[PDB]
Curated annotation (Swiss-Prot), chain A:
Shown residues in whole-protein numbering: 156 to 971 of 971
Residues in HEAT repeats: 44-82, 118-155, 195-232, 358-395, 441-478, 525-562, 567-604, 637-674, 677-715
Function: Contacts pre-mRNA on both sides of the branch site early in spliceosome assembly.
Originating gene: HSH155
NAD found in the keyword field: no
Miscellaneous information on this protein: Present with 521 molecules/cell in log phase SD medium.
GO CC term (a single one): nucleus
Chief location category: nucleus
UniProt family annotation: Belongs to the SF3B1 family.
Keywords noted in UniProt: mRNA processing, mRNA splicing, Nucleus, Repeat, Spliceosome
Subunit and partners: Belongs to the CWC complex (or CEF1-associated complex), a spliceosome sub-complex reminiscent of a late-stage spliceosome composed of the U2, U5 and U6 snRNAs and at least BUD13, BUD31, BRR2, CDC40, CEF1, CLF1, CUS1, CWC2, CWC15, CWC21, CWC22, CWC23, CWC24, CWC25, CWC27, ECM2, HSH155, IST3, ISY1, LEA1, MSL1, NTC20, PRP8, PRP9, PRP11, PRP19, PRP21, PRP22, PRP45, PRP46, SLU7, SMB1, SMD1, SMD2, SMD3, SMX2, SMX3, SNT309, SNU114, SPP2, SYF1, SYF2, RSE1 and YJU2. Interacts with RDS3.
GO MF, one annotated term: mRNA binding
Localization annotation: Nucleus
Name assigned to this protein: U2 snRNP component HSH155
Curated annotation (Swiss-Prot), chain B:
Gene name of this polypeptide: YSF3
Pfam families named among the record's database cross-references: SF3b10
GO terms of biological process kind: mRNA splicing, via spliceosome; spliceosomal complex assembly; U2-type prespliceosome assembly
Disulfide pattern: none
Keywords: mRNA processing, mRNA splicing, Nucleus
Protein name: RDS3 complex subunit 10
Swiss-Prot record, chain D:
Subunit details: Belongs to the CWC complex (or CEF1-associated complex), a spliceosome sub-complex reminiscent of a late-stage spliceosome composed of the U2, U5 and U6 snRNAs and at least BUD13, BUD31, BRR2, CDC40, CEF1, CLF1, CUS1, CWC2, CWC15, CWC21, CWC22, CWC23, CWC24, CWC25, CWC27, ECM2, HSH155, IST3, ISY1, LEA1, MSL1, NTC20, PRP8, PRP9, PRP11, PRP19, PRP21, PRP22, PRP45, PRP46, SLU7, SMB1, SMD1, SMD2, SMD3, SMX2, SMX3, SNT309, SNU114, SPP2, SYF1, SYF2, RSE1 and YJU2. Interacts with CUS2.
Gene: PRP11
Parent-protein start and end of this portion: 34 to 253 of 266
Protein name: Pre-mRNA-splicing factor PRP11
Zinc fingers, Matrin-type class: 30-60
Signal peptide: none
Note: Present with 3460 molecules/cell in log phase SD medium.
Keywords in alphabetical order: Metal-binding, mRNA processing, mRNA splicing, Nucleus, Spliceosome, Zinc, Zinc-finger
Family: Belongs to the SF3A2 family.
Function text: mRNA splicing factors, PRP9, PRP11, and PRP21, are necessary for addition of the U2 snRNP to the pre-mRNA in an early step of spliceosome assembly.
GO cellular component, one term: catalytic step 2 spliceosome
GO molecular function terms attached to this record: RNA binding; zinc ion binding
Species of origin: Saccharomyces cerevisiae (strain ATCC 204508 / S288c) (Baker's yeast)
Localization: Nucleus
From Swiss-Prot, chain E:
Protein name: Pre-mRNA-splicing factor RDS3
Species of origin: Saccharomyces cerevisiae (strain ATCC 204508 / S288c)
Chief place of localization: nucleus
Annotated gene: RDS3
Localization: Nucleus
Functional summary from the UniProt entry: Required for pre-mRNA splicing. Involved in regulation of drug sensitivity and may play a role in multidrug resistance.
Record keywords, A-Z: mRNA processing, mRNA splicing, Nucleus, Spliceosome
Length: 816, 84, 211, 174, 103
RNA sequence: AAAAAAAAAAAACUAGAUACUAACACAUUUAAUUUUUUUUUGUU
C-alpha cells in the first residue's frame, strides 16, 4: 500500500502538472509518463485520468493536454480491455463534431490509434448497443466515430456490420445511422471509395425504400456523397438505384424532392453522353417549376443541378441564353441573397460555372446591373463573380462598350468600399492585367482617384489606394506614361512618412513595383536620396513595413549598387544584423538574401568581419542566420574569399563560434553546387578536428558538411579524402540522440556515393550480423539505407562464396 | 520516442516497397534468399550479363537462360530439376 | 554453441576470431564474412560504456592550426584569435587554384584505417616526417651539442665499429676513416649511403584562369 | 563567481594558480583534469571542488605521489645580517636551526654542462645558498677527532667541524 | 518532415498531378526543407488529390497552395525524390499546441 | 648503479545547477463546397 500509494501519488502529481502546471514542468512530466507508461497499470492510468475529462469546468487548453496524454499512452501500451475502450470512446467521440477542424483532427487521431490498439472485434461489440440508442446526439456522434474506425481498419472488415445495421428490420434508428456511416465513410476515403462502392451499395439501395421519410432522405444524401466522391467511374453501379429516383422525384415533392434532385444532379456528370441529355432535360423542367421555392435547402439543390448540368455537352449555350440564364440572374441575384454568405458562395460559383458555356460578354453583360446597384454588400458579391469569371475566361470577348461600363462600375463600387478585402484589388487588377493595352484611355482618371484616396483621412482607404497602384504599375508601363510613374513615385515618397504602419508597408510595396519597372536613371527622388530615408524605416519594428522595406532595399542592391556610398551600405548591414532577431521567418530570409546583394555591391571582407563578430551572441537565431549570411556571401562573392577568413575564425576557443563556423560552411557548400571540388583538400583537416571533438554537437554539424560535400563532389575524382572522412565517421554509428544520429546517417549515405557502394560496404559486412544485438541493430540501419539507394548496385559486392551459403548461384562461376 | 516510432513505420513501408530489408534479427536463410533474388535479377536484366550466361551455358536460346534464371528464384526449382 | 577452437579451424585467417564470435546466432557464417577478403571489422568501442569519447585522451588536444598554404595568406596576423582586411582577390584566388592546385594534407588515411579514441594523428605525421628527414651518417647541430661532438669529429662509436665492423642493416653505409675517406668528413655528415610517363603524362599544366 | 582569477586554457603551456586543476579546454567549457569532468559554469566547478569524488581523486593522487620520488685544512667565515631584515620574522619557525653544510657533486646542475668536482654548500633559510669548489680529493678529513659522542645533529660533518656564533651571526666551517 | 518527427507522410504511388505549396511554404523541398536549387515537380497519388484537400499546401496542409512544389537537387540525387507521395497527413503537435496556446 | 612493456572511471535512484541542438514554431488565417445534426412537413 504505502509503497504503491506512492505510485498513486505520482500519477496524480504528474497529471496535475500536465493539466495545470508550468511549461518546463508539464514538458518533463510528459516525458516521465511516456517512459513510465508501461510500468503504471493502465487500469490506474485511465481509471485516474478519464474522470477529469467529464466535468464542464475544463478549458479547451486543459482538455487538449489530457487528450495528448491519452494518445501517447494508447500508442504505447498496445493492448486494452473493452470497458476502457467504451470509456475512451465516450470521451473522445464528441470531438469529431467540434466547431473547429483542429479538435476534429486531434480527436480523430485518438480513434484511429485505438482502432489498431483495441482491435477489430472489440470496437464493433461496443458500437452494436450504441447505434440502437434512442438519443439523437449519441447516434450522430458514433456515425462519425464508426466511419473513422472504418477508414482506420479498412472498410471491408467493418462492412457486414454496416450491412447488418442498414438492413436491420429490428430498429429504425439502426437503419438511419447505419446509413449515415456510409456518408462519413464516403467523405473520409475521398476518391478512394471506388472499389468498395459496390459493397457499400448493398446497404443503400434497399435501405432507401423504408416507409419512414427521414431514412429515404439520408439515403438520398449518401447517393450524392458517393456520386461526387466517385466521379465519372461509378456510373455502372448506380444504374440499379437510378430508376427509383425518378418515381420519387415525380411524386413526393416537399423536402424529399430536394434530396432526390441532389442525388440525380450529382449523378449527371458520370453518365454517358447519351443518357446525360435525357436526364438533364428531365431535370430542367422540375428546376424551373421549383424556382419560387422559399426553402433554403431546395434553392441550394437547384443551384447544384444548374451547377452540374452546364458541363453536359447536350445542352447548347444558345439554349442557356434564350431560356435558363435570364430566369437565373433575375431570381438568384436578388439583394436578399447577398446577406447570407453560404448561399452567396453557391450563387457566385454557379454563375462562374455557367460562364464557361455562356458567352463571357453575356455573363459580364448580365453582371453589370448588380455592380451599379446601390447596396454595398451586394456590389461586393457582384465583384466576386466578375473577378472569378474574368480569371477563367479572359477579356478577349468584351466589346469596347462593356469594357467601359465594367471599369466604370469597378471605379464607383471601388471608391465607396468599407470592409478590407482583396477581391477588388485582384478583380479590378484581373481586369487590368487582361485588357492592359486596351486600358490606356481609362488610366488617367483611375490614377487620379488613387491620388485623391491617398489623401483620405481613414487608414483603410489609404491602404486600398496604395495597394491598387502596385497592380497597375506593370500595365502603366504597357500604357507608356512615365510622367505618371514619376508623379506617383513622388507622391508616395512624400507620403512615405506616415504614422500608420499597415498603410506604410503597402506604400513601400508600391515603391517597389515602381522601382523594378522604371528606368533607374529617370527616377526623380532619386534612389541616392531614397535609400538614406529608408534606413531609419528598418527600425519601425512591426513587420510588413520591415518586409517591404527589406525587399525594396534588396531591389536597389540588384539594380543600383553604385549610388549609395559604401559607408551607408555598412549602416544598412549593421541595422539588418540587429533586425534579424525578429520572430517572423520571411523577415530573416529576406534579410539573409540581401547580404548577398550588399556583399556583391560593396565587398565581402567588410561584411564578413561584422558577421563573425555576431557569432559570439548566445541566441540561436542570430548565430544560425549569420551562418546562412556567410553562406550567401561565400556564394555570391566566391568561396576563396570567405573560406580562409572562416577557417581562421574557427580557431577561437569559444564553442558557439566553432559550431557557427561549421554551419556556415554547410550552407556555403550547399549553395555552390558543383564548385566544391577545388575546396575540399583544405577543409578535411578542418573536419578532422570537428569529427574528433568530444561534444556531440561538432560531430553532428560536421557530418552535415560531409553530406553537402560528398553528394555534389562525388565522381569528381578526389575519393581519397572521402575515405579519410569516412574512417573518421564510422565509429560514430553507435552514438545515440536523434539529431546527431540522423545527421551521421545522412553523412554515411552521402559518402556512399563518393566512395561507391562496395568500397563503402567493406566496412559494414563485418558487424552486419555480429553477436551483440546492438552493433547488429546499428549496422542493419545503414544496410537498409544502402539497400534503398542501391539494389542491383550492390550485387557484385556481396560476401558470398559457394561454401559460404547453401545454394549460392552456379552461374556466377561460369567463364567463357 | 516519437522519432523511433516513425522509424519503425518507415521500416514497415520500405520493407514492403523494396522487399528485402534486414531489420535487426534476420535469419541467414532470409537474407541469403534476398541476395539470390538480387543476383539472378541482375543476371537476367542486363542483356550483357544475359549474353554471357547464355553463351557460357551453351543453351539453344536466350529465352531459355532468362526463364531458367526466373524459375531459379523459387525454392522448389532445384528439386524440380532433379525429378526430370 | 561451437567452441572457438572448432570455429577457428574453419577460417583461413583464424587469428581474428574472438571469444564473443563463438556466441553469435550464426557463428559459421559470421566467421566466413569477417575473414572474407576486404571486410573491415566493426569499430572496437562497443562493449565500452564511455560514450566513445572520454576526456582523458581528449583533454590535451590542440585547438586547431590552419594549413601552411592558408597560413601563408597572412590572415593569421590580420585577425587576432588566441587567446578593412585589405586582401587581394587575385592573391586568394591564386592560393586555392594556381598555387595550391596539387596541395593535399600530409596524412589523410588509408582504406583500412579506423580512428579509435586514444589514437592521435599529430604524432604519427611527426613520425613520418621524422623518418623522412632523419638519416644515418648525419646528426643535427642540437644533438651534437647534446653529445658535445663538434663538426668534423667522428662519433664516439666509431671505434667499436672499427673493431666490430659496420652496421648490419647498413651495408652501403660509408663512414669517414674506415670504408670512406676521412677528409670528406665535413660539418655534420660523417657518413653517407652509397649503393615512364605512365602513358598519361599531361605534358601541359594549366590551372583555370581568374581573369 | 570566479573571484576574478584567470583560468588558463589547456594548451597555453604554463602567476600561481589557486587550484591547479580546473582549466578551459580547446573548446569553451571548463574541465577538472583529475576527475576528467566537464563543467558548464563556475558554480558547477565550485560544486565539483566541494564534491566527494574530487576529494577521492586528490587523495589517490596523494598516495600516487607518496610512493615515488699534521696537514692542511680550509676554514670559512660566513657573516650574516645585522638585525636589518630579521626584525619582521621571529615566530620560532626553525629560527633555532643553525646554518647547514653539505658536500655536493657537480654531476647535477640546472644547466648540466661541465662537472667533475665537489662543492661545500652552505645554507640558511632566508639567505641564498653558497658553494666552494674542492679540487683536492681530500683535505682535513680527520680520523676520530673527538671521543665518539653520538648526537648526529645532521651528520658527522656538521657536528665534527662547524661552529655557529648565533649571538654575532657568524658561521665558521673547518 | 525533417525537423518535426510526429509528422507522417503518405508514400503511395505518385499520380499525374503536381502538389502545391502555400505562399508561406513556397520554394521548399518537401523532404529536407531546402530553399535552394530546385530540380523537379512533386507528384501526388489519387488519394491525396480528390477535392478541396488538393488545394492545400502539401507541407502544412492548412493554407491554400499556389506554386508547384519542387524536389531539391540533392533529394533527387539521393533518390528520395521517387519514394512516393510526399504529402504530410497529420498536422503535428506543434501547430495544435500553438492553436490552443493562443486560444 | 637498474626496468614501470603503456589503460582506468561506476552503476542505480532521487532531486537540484547550467549550457545546447533542430533556417523547429511565432500573426496571419476566410469566396466553390460537409459539425450544419430533429420527432418529414412551406401554399395554383
Ligand atoms: Zn576534480
Ligand atoms: Zn498521397
Ligand atoms: Zn504550407
Ligand atoms: Zn531536398
Amino acid at each position: 500500500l504505502n509503497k504503491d500509494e506512492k505510485k498513486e501519488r505520482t500519477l496524480s502529481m504528474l497529471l496535475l502538472k500536465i493539466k495545470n502546471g508550468n511549461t518546463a514542468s508539464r514538458r518533463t512530466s510528459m516525458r516521465i509518463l511516456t517512459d513510465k507508461a508501461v510500468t503504471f497499470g493502465p487500469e490506474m492510468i485511465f481509471n485516474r485520468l478519464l474522470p477529469i475529462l467529464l466535468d464542464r469546468s475544463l478549458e479547451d487548453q486543459e482538455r487538449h493536454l489530457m487528450i495528448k496524454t491519452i494518445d501517447r499512452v494508447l500508442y504505447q501500451l498496445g493492448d486494452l480491455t473493452k470497458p476502457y475502450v467504451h470509456k475512451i470512446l465516450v470521451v473522445a467521440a464528441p470531438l469529431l463534431i467540434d466547431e473547429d477542424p483542429m479538435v476534429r483532427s486531434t480527436g480523430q487521431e485518438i480513434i484511429t490509434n485505438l482502432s489498431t490498439v483495441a482491435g477489430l472485434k472489440t470496437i464493433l461489440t461496443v458500437m452494436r448497443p450504441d447505434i440502437e440508442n434512442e438519443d439523437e446526439y449519441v447516434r450522430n456522434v458514433t456515425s462519425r466515430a464508426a466511419a473513422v474506425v472504418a477508414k482506420a481498419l479498412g472498410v471491408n472488415q467493418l462492412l457486414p456490420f454496416i450491412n447488418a445495421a442498414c438492413h436491420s428490420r429490428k430498429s429504425w434508428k439502426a437503419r438511419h445511422t447505419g446509413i449515415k456511416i456510409v456518408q462519413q465513410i464516403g467523405i473520409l476515403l475521398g476518391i478512394g471509395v471506388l472499389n468498395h462502392l459496390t459493397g457499400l451499395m448493398s446497404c443503400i439501395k434497399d435501405c432507401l425504400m423504408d416507409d419512414h421519410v427521414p431514412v429515404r432522405i439520408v439515403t438520398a444524401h449518401t447517393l450524392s456523397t458517393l456520386a461526387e466522391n466517385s466521379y465519372p467511374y461509378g456510373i455502372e453501379v448506380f444504374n440499379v438505384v437510378l430508376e427509383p429516383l425518378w418515381k420519387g422525384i415525380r411524386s413526393h415533392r416537399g423536402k424529399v424532392l430536394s434530396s432526390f434532385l441532389k442525388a440525380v444532379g450529382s449523378m449527371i456528370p458520370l453518365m454517358d453522353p447519351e443518357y446525360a441529355g435525357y436526364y438533364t432535360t428531365e431535370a430542367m423542367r422540375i428546376i424551373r417549376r421549383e424556382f419560387d421555392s422559399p426553402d433554403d435547402e431546395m434553392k441550394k439543390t437547384i443551384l447544384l443541378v444548374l451547377q452540374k448540368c452546364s458541363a453536359v455537352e447536350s445542352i447548347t449555350p444558345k439554349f442557356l441564353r434564350e431560356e435558363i440564364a435570364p430566369e437565373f440572374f433575375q431570381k438568384f441575384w436578388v439583394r436578399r441573397v447577398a446577406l447570407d454568405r453560404p448561399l452567396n458562395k453557391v450563387v457566385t460559383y454557379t454563375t462562374v460555372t455557367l460562364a464557361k458555356k455562356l458567352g463571357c460578354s453575356y455573363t459580364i453583360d448580365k453582371l453589370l446591373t448588380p455592380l451599379r446597384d446601390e447596396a454595398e454588400p451586394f456590389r461586393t458579391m457582384a465583384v466576386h463573380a466578375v473577378t472569378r469569371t474574368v480569371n477563367l475566361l479572359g477579356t478577349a470577348d468584351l466589346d469596347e462598350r462593356l469594357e467601359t461600363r465594367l471599369i466604370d462600375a469597378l471605379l464607383i463600387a471601388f471608391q465607396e468600399q468599407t470592409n478590407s478585402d482583396s477581391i477588388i484589388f485582384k478583380g479590378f487588377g484581373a481586369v487590368t492585367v487582361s485588357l492592359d493595352i486596351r486600358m490606356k484611355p481609362f488610366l488617367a482618371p483611375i490614377v487620379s482617384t488613387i491620388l485623391n484616396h491617398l489623401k483620405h483621412k481613414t487608414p483603410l482607404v489609404r491602404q486600398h489606394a496604395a495597394d491598387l497602384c502596385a497592380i497597375l504599375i506593370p500595365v502603366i508601363k504597357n500604357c507608356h506614361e512615365f510622367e505618371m510613374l514619376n508623379k506617383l513615385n513622388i507622391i508616395l515618397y512624400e507620403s512615405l512618412g506616415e504614422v500608420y504602419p499597415e498603410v506604410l508597408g503597402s506604400i513601400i510595396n508600391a515603391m517597389y513595383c515602381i522601382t523594378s519597372v522604371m528606368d533607374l536613371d529617370k527616377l526623380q527622388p532619386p534612389i541616392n536620396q531614397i535609400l538614406p530615408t529608408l534606413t531609419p524605416i528598418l527600425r519601425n519594428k512591426h513587420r510588413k513595413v520591415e518586409v517591404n522595406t527589406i525587399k525594396f532595399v534588396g531591389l536597389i542592391g540588384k539594380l543600383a549598387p553604385t549610388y549609395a556610398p559604401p559607408k551607408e551600405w555598412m549602416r544598412i548591414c549593421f541595422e539588418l544584423l540587429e533586425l534579424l532577431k525578429s520572430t517572423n521567418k520571411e523577415i530573416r530570409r529576406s534579410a539573409n538574401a540581401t547580404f548577398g546583394f550588399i556583399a556583391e555591391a560593396i565587398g565581402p571582407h567588410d561584411v564578413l568581419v561584422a558577421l563573425l563578430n555576431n557569432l559570439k551572441v548566445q541566441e540561436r537565431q542570430l548565430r544560425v542566420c549569420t551562418a546562412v549570411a556567410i553562406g550567401i556571401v561565400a556564394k555570391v562573392c566566391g568561396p576563396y574569399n570567405v573560406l580562409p577568413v572562416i577557417m581562421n575564425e574557427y580557431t577561437t576557443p569559444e564553442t558557439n563560434v566553432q559550431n557557427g563556423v561549421l554551419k556556415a560552411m554547410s550552407f556555403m557548400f550547399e549553395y555552390i553546387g558543383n564548385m566544391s571540388k577545388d575546396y575540399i583538400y583544405f577543409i578535411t583537416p578542418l573536419l578532422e578536428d570537428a569529427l574528433t571533438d568530444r561534444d556531440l554537437v561538432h560531430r553532428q554539424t560536421a557530418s552535415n558538411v560531409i553530406t553537402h560535400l560528398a553528394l555534389n563532389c562525388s565522381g569528381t575524382g578526389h575519393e581519397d579524402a572521402f575515405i579519410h572522412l569516412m574512417n573518421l565517421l564510422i565509429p560514430n554509428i553507435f552514438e545515440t540522440s536523434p539529431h546527431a544520429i540522423m545527421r551521421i546517417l545522412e553523412g554515411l549515405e552521402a559518402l556512399s556515393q563518393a566512395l561507391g557502394p562496395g568500397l563503402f560496404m567493406n566496412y559494414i559486412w563485418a558487424g552486419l550480423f555480429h553477436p551483440a544485438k546492438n552493433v547488429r541493430k546499428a549496422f542493419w540501419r545503414v544496410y537498409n539505407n544502402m539497400y534503398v539507394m542501391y539494389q542491383d548496385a550492390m550485387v557484385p559486392f556481396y560476401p558470398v562464396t559457394p561454401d559460404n551459403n547453401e545454394e549460392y548461384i552456379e552461374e556466377l562461376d561460369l567463364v567463357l | 520516442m516519437a522519432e523511433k516510432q516513425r522509424q519503425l513505420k518507415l521500416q514497415k513501408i520500405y520493407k514492403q516497397k523494396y522487399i528485402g530489408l534486414g531489420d535487426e534479427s534476420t535469419t541467414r536463410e532470409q537474407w541469403q534468399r534476398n541476395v539470390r533474388n538480387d543476383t539472378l535479377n541482375t543476371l537476367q536484366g542486363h542483356s550483357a550479363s544475359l549474353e554471357y550466361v547464355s553463351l557460357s551455358r551453351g543453351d539453344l536460346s536466350i529465352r531459355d537462360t532468362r526463364i531458367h534464371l526466373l524459375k531459379s528464384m523459387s525454392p522448389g526449382y532445384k528439386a524440380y530439376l532433379r525429378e526430370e | 554453441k561451437p567452441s572457438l577452437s572448432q570455429l577457428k579451424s574453419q577460417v583461413p585467417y583464424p587469428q581474428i576470431i574472438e571469444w564473443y564470435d563463438c556466441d553469435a546466432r550464426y557463428p559459421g557464417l559470421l566467421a566466413s564474412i569477417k575473414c572474407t577478403k576486404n571486410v573491415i571489422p566493426v569499430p572496437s568501442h562497443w562493449q565500452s560504456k564511455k560514450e566513445y569519447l572520454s576526456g582523458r585522451s581528449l583533454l590535451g588536444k590542440r585547438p586547431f592550426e590552419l594549413p601552411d598554404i592558408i597560413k601563408k595568406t597572412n590572415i593569421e596576423q590580420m585577425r587576432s584569435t588566441l587567446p578593412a582586411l585589405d586582401l587581394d582577390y587575385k592573391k586568394l584566388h591564386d592560393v586555392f587554384f594556381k598555387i595550391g592546385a596539387n596541395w593535399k594534407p600530409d596524412h589523410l588515411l588509408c582504406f583500412g584505417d579506423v580512428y579509435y579514441e586514444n589514437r592521435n594523428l599529430f604524432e604519427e605525421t611527426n613520425w613520418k616526417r621524422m623518418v623522412d628527414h632523419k638519416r644515418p651518417g648525419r646528426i643535427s647541430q642540437e644533438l651534437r651539442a647534446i653529445m658535445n661532438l663538434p663538426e668534423g669529429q667522428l662519433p664516439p662509436w666509431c671505434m667499436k665499429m672499427k673493431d666490430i665492423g659496420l652496421p648490419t642493416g647498413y651495408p652501403d653505409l660509408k663512414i669517414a676513416g674506415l670504408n670512406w675517406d676521412i677528409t670528406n668528413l665535413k660539418g655534420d655528415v660523417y657518413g653517407k649511403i652509397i649503393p615512364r610517363n605512365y602513358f598519361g603524362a599531361l605534358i601541359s599544366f594549366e590551372t583555370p584562369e581568374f581573369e | 563567481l570566479s573571484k576574478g582569477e584567470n583560468v588558463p586554457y589547456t594548451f597555453q603551456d604554463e602567476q600561481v594558480r589557486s587550484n591547479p586543476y580546473i582549466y578551459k579546454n580547446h573548446s569553451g567549457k571548463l574541465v577538472c583534469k583529475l576527475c576528467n569532468t566537464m563543467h558548464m559554469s563556475w558554480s558547477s566547478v565550485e560544486r565539483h571542488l566541494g564534491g566527494k569524488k574530487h576529494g577521492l581523486n586528490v587523495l589517490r593522487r596523494g598516495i600516487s605521489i607518496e610512493k615515488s620520488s699534521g696537514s692542511v685544512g680550509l676554514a670559512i667565515q660566513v657573516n650574516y645580517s645585522s638585525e636589518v631584515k630579521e626584525n619582521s620574522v621571529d615566530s620560532d619557525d626553525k629560527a633555532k636551526v643553525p646554518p647547514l653544510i653539505r658536500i655536493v657533486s657537480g654531476l647535477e646542475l640546472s644547466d648540466t654542462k661541465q662537472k667533475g668536482k665537489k662543492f661545500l654548500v652552505i645554507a640558511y633559510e632566508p639567505f641564498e645558498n653558497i658553494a666552494i669548489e674542492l679540487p683536492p680529493n681530500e683535505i682535513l678529513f680527520s680520523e676520530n677527532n673527538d671521543m665518539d659522542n653520538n648526537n648526529d645533529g645532521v651528520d658527522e660533518l656538521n657536528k665534527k667541524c662547524t661552529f655557529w656564533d648565533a649571538i654575532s651571526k657568524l658561521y665558521y666551517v673547518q | 518532415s525533417r525537423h518535426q518527427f510526429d509528422l507522417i507522410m503518405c508514400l503511395k504511388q505518385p499520380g499525374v498531378q503536381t502538389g502545391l505549396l502555400c505562399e508561406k511554404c513556397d520554394g521548399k523541398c518537401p523532404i529536407c526543407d531546402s530553399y535552394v536549387r530546385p530540380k523537379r515537380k512533386v507528384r501526388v497519388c489519387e488519394n491525396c488529390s480528390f477535392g478541396k484537400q488538393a488545394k492545400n499546401c502539401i507541407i502544412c496542409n492548412l493554407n491554400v497552395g499556389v506554386n508547384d512544389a519542387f524536389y531539391c537537387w540533392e533529394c533527387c540525387r539521393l533518390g528520395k525524390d521517387k519514394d512516393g507521395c510526399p504529402r504530410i497527413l497529420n498536422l503535428g503537435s506543434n501547430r495544435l499546441d500553438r492553436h490552443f496556446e493562443k486560444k
